[PDB]
Structures are given as structure tokens and as C-alpha cells.
Amino acid sequence: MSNYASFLKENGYSYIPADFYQQKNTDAAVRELQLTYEDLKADPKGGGRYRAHSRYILAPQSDTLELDPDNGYFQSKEYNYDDGGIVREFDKISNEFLQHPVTQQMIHSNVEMARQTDFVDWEKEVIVGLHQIRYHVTPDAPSYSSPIWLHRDDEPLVFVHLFKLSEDAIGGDNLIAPSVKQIDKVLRLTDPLETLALGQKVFHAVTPVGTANIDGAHRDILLVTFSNR
Amino acid sequence: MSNYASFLKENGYSYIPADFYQQKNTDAAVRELQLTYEDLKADPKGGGRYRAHSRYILAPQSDTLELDPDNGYFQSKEYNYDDGGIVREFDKISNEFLQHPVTQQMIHSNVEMARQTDFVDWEKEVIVGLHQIRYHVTPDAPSYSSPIWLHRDDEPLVFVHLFKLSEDAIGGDNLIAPSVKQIDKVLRLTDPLETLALGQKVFHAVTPVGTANIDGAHRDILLVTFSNR
Amino acid sequence: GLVPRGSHMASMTGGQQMGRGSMSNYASFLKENGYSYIPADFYQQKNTDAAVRELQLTYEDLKADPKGGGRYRAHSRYILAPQSDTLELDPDNGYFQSKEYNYDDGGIVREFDKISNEFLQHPVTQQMIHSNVEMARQTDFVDWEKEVIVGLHQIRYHVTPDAPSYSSPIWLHRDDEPLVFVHLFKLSEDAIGGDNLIAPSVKQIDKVLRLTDPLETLALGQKVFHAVTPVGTANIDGAHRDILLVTFSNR
Amino acid sequence: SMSNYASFLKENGYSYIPADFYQQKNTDAAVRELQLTYEDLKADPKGGGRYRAHSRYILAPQSDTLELDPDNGYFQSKEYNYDDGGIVREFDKISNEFLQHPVTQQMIHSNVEMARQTDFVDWEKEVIVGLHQIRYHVTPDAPSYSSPIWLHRDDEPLVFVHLFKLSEDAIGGDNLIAPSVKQIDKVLRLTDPLETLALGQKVFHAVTPVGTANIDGAHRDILLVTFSNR
Ligand SMILES: CC[C@H](C)[C@H](N)C(=O)O
Ligand SMILES: CC[C@H](C)[C@H](N)C(=O)O
Ligand SMILES: CC[C@H](C)[C@H](N)C(=O)O
Ligand SMILES: CC[C@H](C)[C@H](N)C(=O)O
Numbered sequence: 001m002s003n004y005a006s007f008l009k010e011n012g013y014s015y016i017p018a019d020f021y022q023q024k025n026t027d028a029a030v031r032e033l034q035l036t037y038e039d040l041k042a043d044p045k046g047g048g049r050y051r052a053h054s055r056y057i058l059a060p061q062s063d064t065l066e067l068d069p070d071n072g073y074f075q076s077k078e079y080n081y082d083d084g085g086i087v088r089e090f091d092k093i094s095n096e097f098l099q100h101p102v103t104q105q106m107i108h109s110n111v112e113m114a115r116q117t118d119f120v121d122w123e124k125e126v127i128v129g130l131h132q133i134r135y136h137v138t139p140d141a142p143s144y145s146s147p148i149w150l151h152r153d154d155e156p157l158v159f160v161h162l163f164k165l166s167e168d169a170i171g172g173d174n175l176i177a178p179s180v181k182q183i184d185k186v187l188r189l190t191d192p193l194e195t196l197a198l199g200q201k202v203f204h205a206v207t208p209v210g211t212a213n214i215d216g217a218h219r220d221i222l223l224v225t226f227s228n229r
Numbered sequence: 230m231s232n233y234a235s236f237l238k239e240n241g242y243s244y245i246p247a248d249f250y251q252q253k254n255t256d257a258a259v260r261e262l263q264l265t266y267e268d269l270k271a272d273p274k275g276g277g278r279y280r281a282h283s284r285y286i287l288a289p290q291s292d293t294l295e296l297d298p299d300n301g302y303f304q305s306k307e308y309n310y311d312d313g314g315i316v317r318e319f320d321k322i323s324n325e326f327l328q329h330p331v332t333q334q335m336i337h338s339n340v341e342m343a344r345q346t347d348f349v350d351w352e353k354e355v356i357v358g359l360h361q362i363r364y365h366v367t368p369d370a371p372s373y374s375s376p377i378w379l380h381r382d383d384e385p386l387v388f389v390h391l392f393k394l395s396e397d398a399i400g401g402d403n404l405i406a407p408s409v410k411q412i413d414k415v416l417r418l419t420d421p422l423e424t425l426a427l428g429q430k431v432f433h434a435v436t437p438v439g440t441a442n443i444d445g446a447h448r449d450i451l452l453v454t455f456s457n458r
Numbered sequence: 459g460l461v462p463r464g465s466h467m468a469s470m471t472g473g474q475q476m477g478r479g480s481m482s483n484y485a486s487f488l489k490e491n492g493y494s495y496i497p498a499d500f501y502q503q504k505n506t507d508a509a510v511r512e513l514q515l516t517y518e519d520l521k522a523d524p525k526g527g528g529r530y531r532a533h534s535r536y537i538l539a540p541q542s543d544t545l546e547l548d549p550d551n552g553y554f555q556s557k558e559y560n561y562d563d564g565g566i567v568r569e570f571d572k573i574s575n576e577f578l579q580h581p582v583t584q585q586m587i588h589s590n591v592e593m594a595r596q597t598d599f600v601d602w603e604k605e606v607i608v609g610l611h612q613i614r615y616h617v618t619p620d621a622p623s624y625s626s627p628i629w630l631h632r633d634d635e636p637l638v639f640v641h642l643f644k645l646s647e648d649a650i651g652g653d654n655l656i657a658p659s660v661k662q663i664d665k666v667l668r669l670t671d672p673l674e675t676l677a678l679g680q681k682v683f684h685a686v687t688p689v690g691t692a693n694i695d696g697a698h699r700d701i702l703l704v705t706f707s708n709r
Numbered sequence: 710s711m712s713n714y715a716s717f718l719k720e721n722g723y724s725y726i727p728a729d730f731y732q733q734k735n736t737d738a739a740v741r742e743l744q745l746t747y748e749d750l751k752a753d754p755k756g757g758g759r760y761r762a763h764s765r766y767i768l769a770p771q772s773d774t775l776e777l778d779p780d781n782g783y784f785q786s787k788e789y790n791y792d793d794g795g796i797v798r799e800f801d802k803i804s805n806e807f808l809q810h811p812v813t814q815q816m817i818h819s820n821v822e823m824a825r826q827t828d829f830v831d832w833e834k835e836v837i838v839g840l841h842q843i844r845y846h847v848t849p850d851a852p853s854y855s856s857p858i859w860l861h862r863d864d865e866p867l868v869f870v871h872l873f874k875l876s877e878d879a880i881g882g883d884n885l886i887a888p889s890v891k892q893i894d895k896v897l898r899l900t901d902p903l904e905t906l907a908l909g910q911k912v913f914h915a916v917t918p919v920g921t922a923n924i925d926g927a928h929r930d931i932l933l934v935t936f937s938n939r
């Protein structure tokens with residue numbers, strides 16, 4: 001674990017294999033979560049995205065995640081250049097998803113890694129934000145991130161957990177870049193729970209998702225953000 | 230009066246000159262209120278702000294403002310993206326301030342304007358919230374709003390009464406905007422009781438206050454909010 | 459079906475009658491007998507299990523009842539103005555019962571958490587409240603000329619082999635609130651107790667009856683005594699009985 | 710000695726104060742003027758045979774100027790007053806004759822001083838000195854009782870109960886002090902004008918319902934002086 005957190009601290013990003021999360025979980029348990037993605041509602045701003053958001057609060061010397069009843073999501077336009085600057089109302093992440101043992105195990109593993117970093121002030125309240133996202137595609141309409149290309153997120157540390165990737169889906173390559181003129185890493189998450197942690201040090205992106213097949217394809221992910229108040 | 234309420238209804242905001250409030254009030258009476266600003270305590274969340282809050286309740290077919298003994302102030306993260314989502318404890322607005330004839334005259338003029346709008350449901354309880362705010366600035370630390378930039382407030386109608394603006398103060402320009410990519414109105418309150426009404430239709434902000442003179446400066450305002458339960 | 463609608467016997471295996479019952483049937487039974495069993499049919503008719511399961515999970519977040527008993531809860535109340543259908547959520551949350559009714563924790567005001575808006579605003583919850591409201595209106599159990607308080611108690615009885623859970627108050631009682639609806643939301647298969655009792659006196663028991671399937675309901679008027687037998691469990695991982703009370707009373 | 714009563718109050722959460730301490734200088738004729746104002750009081754909306762007025766003063770942090778609040782709404786949370794709490798009650802205002810009368814003013818300042826020798830309110834902040842002129846009015850068919858009816862605590866951390874009159878054929882109006890709702894430590898009945906009882910939130914208190922033998926009616930007239938923050 002500290003290996004990945006060290007790599008993250010120096011490079012500003014870290015690939016984390018599914019091993020590290022799946023070690024303790026059957027595929028059937030992970031598949032239950034995968035199915036929740038079918039119920040997600042459309043992202044207002046579009047892009048073929050289907051979302052939920054829920055955040056927990058971590059009081060300074062506490063391990064009790066306290067679920068925030070408010071759901072509005074905001075990023076400044078200084079980071080998210082597409083949909084930033086305004087508050088977005090998404091649905092809440094189903095309790096099935098939130099409370100599922102896998103989800104909870106992933107959150108605490110992320111929390112521990114996050115604690116081995118100075119990426120947030122642990123003296124103050126920490127917001128553990130979760131984004132359940134499906135990029136949904138059909139040959140006529142592809143899907144892409146908000147924002148679309150290389151960016152940084154407001155949240156100093158973001159974990160990208162893959163949950164599913166349809167075998168006839170293209171794109172969804174993650175990019176790591178030190179500037180907007182050059183790309184250091186291309187890397188594509190394909191198997192469930194393959195993860196990528198991202199610090200503000202670098203730029204990151206996700207290549208737009210598309211599909212050959214007319215019946216559609218999808219890329220399902222879970223973001224786990226860490227930030228202060 | 231209906232002039233300003235009409236302008237407000239169409240444009241989503243309205244400049245109201247001091248005349249409309251100082252109508253028969255001497256400057257000495259307005260100056261008494263100005264001095265109360267020196268006693269305000271620091272806003273917990275900072276930004277060089279010094280505050281009090283008090284709210285009144287208006288029962289449906291009543292003109293009796295009934296002072297609420299509870300003082301906690303909340304805005305959803307859906308509107309106030311900085312300090313929203315949590316309840317803030319401020320001091321209460323001094324009785325001197327609340328009961329002063331000027332203050333009371335301003336509240337009732339606001340109430341009347343507000344009643345000529347559909348911005349709140351007058352069938353239900355209406356919360357008339359008051360925020361006495363000093364933006365205080367010193368060469369090391371300027372002052373700014375919560376939230377910092379363009380936003381909407383939970384409260385459908387907000388009146389911004391200026392009480393003082395130090396001759397060596399910069400910023401405190403109010404901005405009116407249809408989106409976060411464009412600004413339609415810039416407008417700066419400078420003379421006591423110059424007012425600006427704000428509906429949820431538009432985005433508004435206040436440009437950070439700072440100072441030309443090394444001795445520092447301040448911008449003192451009274452907000453009068455209108456909202457339902 | 460030879461058994462009546464509100465009849466506790468409807469909750470007996472091979473004693474059910476078919477189809478949804480009309481509301482007024484149960485309200486009539488309630489008016490005469492002072493209680494009424496209402497099958498999940500009457501509420502679940504229009505609700506998927508997935509929708510009901512969302513609500514079930516909210517029970518995991520409930521905080522401990524100060525007075526204990528393995529209970530975890532929230533409380534929120536709405537107000538119904540005399541000629542209104544607008545439920546207006548009360549910002550005050552203190553819960554009180556006189557010791558003349560609740561002999562354990564009565565006589566003092568209890569501060570609970572508020573019922574999450576997820577729970578309150580959920581379509582199922584709202585549908586149940588309005589069905590209860592309608593039934594309640596067909597009774598003289600409250601004065602509809604005056605303000606009516608529609609109180610909601612989200613309660614989990616949580617149990618482990620070492621520590622069982624029980625009601626406040628513990629045994630047969632009446633509640634201050636003239637009409638109380640008991641909606642079951644979940645009952646873990648290895649939970650014991652949670653039998654509801656109906657009694658005309660404290661020396662005799664007329665009905666024993668156990669809610670097990672989600673949204674199985676029991677309405678209770680002040681006419682009778684009622685109880686809930688303590689919940690316990692065989693299994694060391696715990697069990698639970700999750701309910702929603704919907705009270706009706708005047709100001 | 711004043712500090713004696715304030716010390717007793719601080720430790721026990723309540724204190725009996727004899728009429729001596731207030732009547733010391735004031736003639737009975739002066740006290741009787743105030744007593745008569747009770748005949749004009751209007752019915753408490755919520756009932757219970759009560760007849761009321763309310764007025765409150767504000768005490769700025771470093772000030773001895775009581776500033777009369779022109780607003781009159783009275784509120785207690787349901788967390789304390791389990792009967793009529795949770796809503797704002799509109800009562801009449803206490804007549805200026807009553808408020809400004811030297812007796813009344815002397816009582817308020819003596820209460821203020823006692824109150825200041827306690828931590829029962831934050832004197833750094835504004836203090837609300839609330840006054841309730843109350844008549845419990847009774848006839849054999851309809852008795853009178855407090856809001857709330859039985860043992861309770863009030864929102865206001867310190868409450869002074871001054872008796873002004875008690876008709877000789879009036880029963881009840883015993884004040885109770887209790888550590889819980891299962892037990893009663895003190896029973897105590899105010900009968901002579903200006904006999905007082907101070908009450909802190911530490912304990913539970915009640916007033917046993919007032920009733921009467923006589924068909925022409927009887928009454929118990931009191932003045933409450935509350936202290937609380939804002
Ligand atoms: C943490 C990533 C966030 C959610 C992303 N930039 C978005 O707003 O869609
Ligand atoms: C802004 C982060 C994005 C959404 C994430 N890295 C993804 O692969 O979809
Ligand atoms: C109604 C305006 C409020 C007070 C402002 N957005 C703040 O939170 O400071
Ligand atoms: C959010 C409203 C702000 C506080 C107000 N318009 C001002 O000028 O400061």
C-alpha cells in the first residue's frame with residue numbers, strides 16, 4: 001500500500017492493480033455493484049454520461065464517515081473548464097452501492113493511502129466524494145469526460161476505479177501529462193477494480209469512449225475524491 | 230416603489246437609490262447604525278468578514294415580524310459552493326440595530342417590494358433574514374463574499390444595503406451575469422443606503438474588497454433576505 | 459374469503475383473502491375494533507421491491523435512541539392545517555409522551571435525529587403517508603377541525619445474542635397519539651420476537667400477530683392496549699426489525 | 710443577605726426568597742395598586758383559566774439600562790414546554806403602570822443582581838429579562854394550571870416566581886421542586902405578597918393546579934421574571 005502512496009506522492013499519480021482491491025472480494029460481489037450502473041440517470045450537461053454523487057465527511061480525529069445529506073456538486077471553472085463555475089444537481093448514489101462491503105472496503109483503502117499523503121489537511125474536515133459514472137455510447141453518439149480533455153480537478157486526490165468495460169468499447173484510455181503539450185503516460189483500465197490515483201501535480205484525461213456495435217457499449221467507473229472544506 | 234419591483238421582475242435585479250430609504254432620516258440617525266459595525270465579530274469561515282445574523286418570521290396573513298430565537302444560518306451546497314452544506318453560527322444582530330427606526334423602515338419597504346413579486350409563496354411562512362456584514366480589509370488580507378465568485382443564493386430575493394464604504398477602498402463592485410462566461414452589469418454601491426435587489430434569475434457576485442490606503446478600509450452592508458420554509 | 463379485512467387473521471397463513479382491499483374496509487374495521495391489520499398488498503400494489511429496498515437501507519444510518527433498548531431512530535413531524543392537504547414539515551424535533559401513557563420514557567422530552575429527506579420525500583413513503591391520512595380522515599380518532607400532527611418514527615430494533623431490543627414502553631400500553639400506524643420495513647430471518655399484541659385489558663390478550671414481510675401494517679387506536687414482544691436473535695452477526703410509525707394527533 | 714439566596718440557588722438550582730427581601734421598604738398600599746392591575750388581564754389564548762401579559766427588556770452586555778422591547782411574541786421550544794411550546798404565543802403587553810411602578814422596578818433590579826452572581830446566563834451577550842404577569846383564575850367547575858401542566862424545565866435558565874395575591878379560598882398553587890419525575894424533594898406554597906421562588910434549569914419544577922371551594926371564584930396572581938440569552 002505505502003508503495004503506491006509513495007509513487008503517488010512523487011509522480012502525482014499511481015496505477016493500482018485490481019489485486020489490491022479484489023484480493024478480498026468474489027467476482028459475484030463485484031458484479032452486483034456493476035448492475036447498479038444500469039439505473040443511473042443522465043448527467044444534465046450530457047456527454048452520454050449517467051451519474052450519481054454522494055459525499056461523506058471525515059471529522060478530524062474520526063474514522064466515522066458521515067453521509068452528507070446535501071448533494072450539489074461544484075468545481076471551479078479554473079479546473080473544470082467545461083461544466084465548472086456552476087453547481088450541478090446529480091442523483092444520490094444508491095444505498096445498495098454505498099453500503100456494499102466492496103465499496104466500503106475500497107473507500108477505507110483509499111482513505112488509508114490518502115492519509116499517507118499531504119494532499120489534504122487531515123487536521124480539518126475531509127470530504128470523501130464519490131462519483132458513480134457510466135459513460136454510455138452508441139455509434140451515433142459517443143461519451144466523454146467533464147472536462148473533455150487534459151485537466152486537473154479541484155479535488156487534490158482522485159481515485160479512478162473501473163467497474164466495467166464492454167468488449168466492443170473504444171477509448172477510455174487514461175492519459176497522464178506534465179503539460180498540455182506533452183503526454184508521459186497512456187494507460188487503459190480494462191478489468192474490474194483496476195485503479196488510477198491522481199494528484200493535482202499532473203494533468204490527466206480520459207480519451208472519449210465510443211463503440212463499433214449498434215447495440216451500444218459502456219464504461220462504468222467509480223471516482224473517490226478527497227478534499228478539504 | 231413598483232418601478233423598482235417591476236425592473237426586478239424582468240431583469241432579475243434592481244438598483245435602488247439611497248433616497249428611497251433615507252427619505253426622511255437624518256444622516257446622524259444613519260451614522261448611529263454605521264457605528265454598530267465596529268462591534269461585529271469575525272465570520273468563523275474567515276474572508277475578512279465580520280457578521281451578525283437575525284431572522285424574523287412572517288405568518289401568512291400577518292405584518293407582525295416575529296424574531297426567531299434560533300440563529301443558525303444554512304445554505305445548501307447547491308447554491309453556496311464555498312461554505313454551504315453546513316450550519317454556521319453567527320452572533321445575533323444587536324437590538325440597537327434591529328429596532329432602530331431606519332432599519333425598521335428599510336425592512337418594511339423591502340417587505341412591500343417583495344410582496345409585489347412571486348419570488349416567494351406568501352401563502353406560507355416567510356423568513357425575513359438579516360445579515361449585518363462588514364468586509365474588513367488590511368494590506369495583508371483583503372475581504373470577499375461567501376461564495377467568492379458568481380453564484381445564486383438559496384434565498385429567492387436578497388436586498389444589498391450599503392451602510393459605509395471607506396474612501397480608500399477598492400473592489401466591492403457588484404456584478405450581474407446571465408452566465409459564468411459573460412457579465413451584463415457592473416455597478417458599485419458607494420453612498421449609504423444605496424441598495425441592490427437580487428433575484429435568483431441571474432448570477433451575482435461582489436468583487437473582492439481591498440485597499441488603496443495602507444491604513445486599511447471597510448465595506449459595511451445589510452442584507453435582507455426573503456425565503457420560504 | 460370469509461375472514462374480514464382488518465382481521466388479524468388475514469396475517470395468518472391460509473387465512474388471507476385475495477386482491478387489494480378498499481381503504482374504507484380497513485378504516486371501518488379500525489373504527490369498530492380499535493385496530494386493523496393491513497396487508498402489504500394495500501401499500502406494495504404500486505411499488506417495486508427495489509424502491510422499497512432503498513428505504514430499507516436508510517435504517518443502517520440511524521443513531522442510537524438515547525434511552526437505549528437497542529433502538530435506533532429518527533423522528534420528523536408534519537402539520538396539517540384544518541382545510542389543507544399540504545403537509546408542512548415542523549422544524550422542531552423534540553418528542554414527548556406523558557408518563558400517563560408511556561410509563562418508561564414518558565414525562566420528559568426526547569431529542570432524536572430527524573428523518574432523512576431521502577426517506578421523507580421518497581415516493582413510497584409519501585404514498586404511505588397519504589393512504590394513512592385518508593384512512594385517518596374516515597375516523598373520529600382526531601379533531602380534523604384543528605391542526606393535526608402527522609408524526610413519523612423511523613425505528614430499528616437492533617439485536618445481538620447478548621443484548622435484545624424492546625419498545626418504549628416495554629409491555630402493553632397506549633400511546634398519547636390516538637392513531638398509530640405500524641409499517642414493517644424489514645425483519646431479519648433469524649430474529650425472534652416482534653410479535654404485536656392486541657389486548658382489551660392488561661390481564662388478557664385477544665390477538666397475537668407478527669409482521670414479517672415489508673409494508674405489512676397494523677393500525678392502532680387508543681381503544682385497545684398494544685405491545686411488541688421484545689426482539690432477540692440466535693445469530694451472532696445480529697438481526698434487526700425495521701419499522702415506520704405514522705402517528706396522528708391534535709395540538 | 711442577597712448573596713445568600715444566590716449561593717443557595719447556584720448549588721440547589723432553586724431558592725425560596727421571603728417577601729422581606731422585596732417588601733422591606735414598600736408600603737402595602739403601593740403593592741395593592743399593582744395587585745389591582747391583575748383584574749384587567751386578558752385570557753391566555755391556550756386557556757387553562759390563565760390571564761396574562763408579557764413584556765421583555767433587553768440588557769446590553771456592559772449596561773444597566775433595561776431597554777423595553779416593542780415586540781411581544783412569546784416562544785418556548787417543545788423541548789422544554791411540552792404543552793404550548795413550538796409555537797409563538799401573542800399575549801398583551803404588561804401595562805406601563807405595572808412595568809414602571811417602583812416596586813416592580815425594585816424587584817427587577819434585585820433579581821438582576823442575584824442573576825449576575827450566577828453563571829446561569831452569558832452576561833457577555835445580550836440578556837433578555839422577560840416578565841409574565843399571570844393570573845390563575847378559578848371557579849369550582851373550571852380550575853387553572855400552568856403551561857406546561859406538570860413537572861418541567863423552562864427555556865429560560867433562571868425564572869423568578871413572585872406571588873402578588875392568593876385568595877383565601879384558593880387551593881393548590883403549591884410549587885414543587887424535583888430532581889426527577891419520579892420523586893419530589895420540595896413542596897412549598899407561596900401565600901403572602903412578594904414571597905418569591907427562584908428556579909434554575911438544574912431541577913424540575915411544577916405548580917399544582919389552582920382550584921376553589923367558593924362559587925364566586927378565587928385567584929392566584931404572580932409575576933415571573935425570566936433571564937435568558939439571545
Ligand atoms: C473528480 C472528477 C469530477 C467529478 C469531474 N471533473 C466532473 O466534474 O465530471
Ligand atoms: C476527471 C476524471 C475522469 C472522470 C476519470 N479519470 C475517468 O477515467 O473517467
Ligand atoms: C444571503 C447571502 C448569504 C449571507 C451569503 N451567500 C453568505 O453566505 O455569506
Ligand atoms: C451574496 C450576496 C453578497 C453578500 C452581497 N451582494 C454583497 O454585496 O456583499
Ligand SMILES: CC[C@H](C)[C@H](N)C(=O)O
Binds near residue numbers: 703
Ligand atoms: C407512538 C409511539 C411512540 C413513538 C413510542 N411510545 C415510543 O416512544 O417509542
Ligand SMILES: CC[C@H](C)[C@H](N)C(=O)O
Binds near residue numbers: 625684
Ligand atoms: C409503540 C408502538 C410500537 C413501536 C410498534 N407497534 C412496533 O411494532 O414496534
Ligand SMILES: CC[C@H](C)[C@H](N)C(=O)O
Binds near residue numbers: 785857865935
Ligand atoms: C417562564 C415560564 C413560562 C412563562 C411558562 N412555561 C409558560 O409557557 O407559560
Ligand SMILES: CC[C@H](C)[C@H](N)C(=O)O
Binds near residue numbers: 856857863870884931
Ligand atoms: C412555569 C413557571 C410557573 C408558571 C410558575 N413557577 C408558577 O408557579 O406559577
